[PDB]
Design a protein around this ligand. Structure first.
Ligand SMILES: [O][B+]1([O])O[C]C2=C1[C]=C([N]C(=S)[N]C1=[C][C]=[C][C]=[C]1)[C]=[C]2
Ligand SMILES: [Zn+2]
Length: 256
């Protein structure tokens, strides 16, 4: 099936998922000089204090840390959002080299990786229903730049040996996602899509201006993961990012 190889990568996805050539595809390049400051945009409201992480898993495309979303424990509200969006999971996209890895770019600059905190609009009842709606998901995107280590990220890095291959999972309770946020919540926002098949156009993207810093060792360990399943030929999980797509008829708004 789909992947990030030369034979099944982003340039091939449109054959099975024609929406790949849609009107509101992600990611996109964020041109800082063209983004429109919108004084009407409200501050984001990230309430993760009651977050309940459950487990971490390697699904062959990235590693996902899942949360209990059967109640309004960890939610995202405010900003450009109407309503309450519940955190269901987070994952990253990264590169084979420090100079690439993020999906969104800023004035064409690529970061070493990009964290996606995925949330779904509770008015739709469940995640499956939400992805069929234009305002079904709110993904908070955060860039990672290589520099000093991110203490909060280390708990995730240390458990990766236990989910090296596709289909492996491990218990991952009591993880606090607040440890993954930068100091500032200034952001850019635009309507887009999942950056992976089915590439549904159901996402309100909220991308933070301020990157978090992670050490070269932390991202290096991301690169030791495998796309393949155990017992299959080893393919390192790197460059699991889709390149910037045409902005088309959309405006990127800035909260600052
Ligand atoms: O492209 B992404 O990596 O970036 C942001 C993001 C990504 C993937 C998903 N999708 C998830 S969690 N499940 C899913 C599975 C099947 C159909 C629809 C959705 C959600 C958010
Ligand atoms: Zn993602």
């Amino acid at each position: 099936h789909w992947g990030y190889g030369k034979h099944n990568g982003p340039e091939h996805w449109h054959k099975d998922f024609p929406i790949a050539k849609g009107e509101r595809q992600s990611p996109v390049d964020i041109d800082t000089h063209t983004a429109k400051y919108d004084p009407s945009l409200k501050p984001l409201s990230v309430s993760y204090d009651q977050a309940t992480s459950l487990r971490i898993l390697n699904n062959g495309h990235a590693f996902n840390v899942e949360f209990d979303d059967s109640q309004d424990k960890a939610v995202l509200k405010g900003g450009p959002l109407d309503g309450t969006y519940r955190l269901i999971q987070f994952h990253f996209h990264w590169g084979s080299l420090d100079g690439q890895g993020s999906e969104h770019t800023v004035d064409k600059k690529k970061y070493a990786a990009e964290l996606h905190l995925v949330h779904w609009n509770t008015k739709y009842g469940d995640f499956g229903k939400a992805v069929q709606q234009p305002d079904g998901l709110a993904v908070l995107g955060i860039f990672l730049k290589v520099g000093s280590a991110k203490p909060g990220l280390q708990k995730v890095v240390d458990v990766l040996d236990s989910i090296k291959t596709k289909g492996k999972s491990a218990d991952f309770t009591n993880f606090d996602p607040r440890g993954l946020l930068p100091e500032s919540l200034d952001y850019w926002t635009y309507p887009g899509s999942l950056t992976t098949p089915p590439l549904l156009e159901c996402v309100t993207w909220i991308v933070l201006k301020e990157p978090i810093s992670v050490s070269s060792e932390q991202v290096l360990k991301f690169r030791k993961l495998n796309f393949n399943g155990e017992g299959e030929p080893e393919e390192l999980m790197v460059d699991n990012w889709r390149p910037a797509q045409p902005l088309k008829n959309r405006q990127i708004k800035a909260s600052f």
